[PDB]
XYZ file of C-alpha atoms in Angstrom:
104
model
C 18.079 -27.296 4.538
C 17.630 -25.329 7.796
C 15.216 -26.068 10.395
C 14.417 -22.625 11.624
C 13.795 -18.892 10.386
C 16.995 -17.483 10.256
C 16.630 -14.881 7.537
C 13.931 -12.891 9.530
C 12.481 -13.770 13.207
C 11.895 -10.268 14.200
C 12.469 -7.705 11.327
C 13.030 -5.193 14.106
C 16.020 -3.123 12.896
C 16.848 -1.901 9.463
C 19.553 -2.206 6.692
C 19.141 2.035 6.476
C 17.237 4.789 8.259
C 17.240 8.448 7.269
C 15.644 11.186 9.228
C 14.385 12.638 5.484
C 11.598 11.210 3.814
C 11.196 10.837 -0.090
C 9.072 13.011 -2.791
C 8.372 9.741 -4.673
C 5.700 9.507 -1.625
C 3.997 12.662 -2.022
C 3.449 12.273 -6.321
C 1.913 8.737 -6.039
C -0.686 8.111 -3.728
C -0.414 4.156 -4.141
C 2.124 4.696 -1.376
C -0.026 5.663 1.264
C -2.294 2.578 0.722
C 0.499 0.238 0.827
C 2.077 1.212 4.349
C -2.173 1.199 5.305
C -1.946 -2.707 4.705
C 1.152 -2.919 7.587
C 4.119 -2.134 5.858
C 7.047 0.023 6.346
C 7.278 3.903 4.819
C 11.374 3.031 4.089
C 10.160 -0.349 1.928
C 7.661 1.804 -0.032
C 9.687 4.643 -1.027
C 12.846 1.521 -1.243
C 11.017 0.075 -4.178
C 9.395 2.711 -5.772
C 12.664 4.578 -6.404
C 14.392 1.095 -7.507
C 11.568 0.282 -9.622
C 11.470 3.524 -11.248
C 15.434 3.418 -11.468
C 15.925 0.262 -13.196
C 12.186 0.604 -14.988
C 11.519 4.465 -16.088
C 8.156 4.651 -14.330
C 5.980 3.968 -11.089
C 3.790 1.304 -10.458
C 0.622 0.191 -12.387
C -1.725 -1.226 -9.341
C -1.817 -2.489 -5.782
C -1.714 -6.035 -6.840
C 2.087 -5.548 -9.011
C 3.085 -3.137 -6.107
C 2.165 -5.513 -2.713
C 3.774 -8.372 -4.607
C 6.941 -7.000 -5.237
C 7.131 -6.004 -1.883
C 6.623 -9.325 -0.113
C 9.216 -10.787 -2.765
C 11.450 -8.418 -1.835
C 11.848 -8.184 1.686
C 11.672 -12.183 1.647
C 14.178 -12.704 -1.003
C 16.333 -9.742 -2.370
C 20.522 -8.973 -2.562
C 21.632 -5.585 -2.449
C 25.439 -3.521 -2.423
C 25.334 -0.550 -0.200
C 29.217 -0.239 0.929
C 29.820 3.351 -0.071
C 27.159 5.444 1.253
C 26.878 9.517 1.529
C 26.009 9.939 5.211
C 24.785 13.560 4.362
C 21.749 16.179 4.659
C 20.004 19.387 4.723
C 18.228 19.544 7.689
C 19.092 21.434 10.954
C 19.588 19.798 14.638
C 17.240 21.132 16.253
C 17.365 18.330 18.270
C 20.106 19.505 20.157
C 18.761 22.947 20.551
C 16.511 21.488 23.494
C 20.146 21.635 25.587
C 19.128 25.320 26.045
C 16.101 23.959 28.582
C 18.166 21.651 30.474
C 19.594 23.395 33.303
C 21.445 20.013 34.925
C 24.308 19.280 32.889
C 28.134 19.301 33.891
């Protein structure tokens, strides 16, 4: 029995973060709705492509969807060791080094 809330205080960082976003958002527009209530993009697209993983299909309503999520980033176990650090998308990021003019 603890006396304090030591499995989230904060919630500041993240157990992943990816600079692409998911296609599972675009399709089903129940996504959009659900971040519009105060949650997180990563959570939304997290469960949808778990749920339709392990189930075959997307959510039926709000309601099934908003509990689920609650449940799950209160109370969920997951095994992420060996992940594929790996994308498509350019740096262009680092193109901006062109502009700088003080560097050594």
């Amino acid at each position: 029995g603890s006396a304090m809330a030591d499995i989230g205080s904060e919630f500041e960082k993240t157990p992943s973060l990816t600079r692409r976003i998911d296609d599972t958002i675009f399709q089903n527009p129940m996504v959009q709705e659900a971040i519009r209530m105060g949650f997180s993009f990563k959570d939304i697209k997290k469960i949808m492509e778990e749920k339709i993983q392990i189930s075959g299909s997307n959510y039926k309503s709000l309601e099934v969807l908003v509990a689920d999520l609650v449940n799950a980033q209160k109370d969920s176990m997951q095994d992420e060791s060996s992940q594929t650090s790996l994308q498509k998308e350019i740096s262009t990021e680092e193109q901006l080094r062109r502009l700088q003019e003080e560097k050594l």
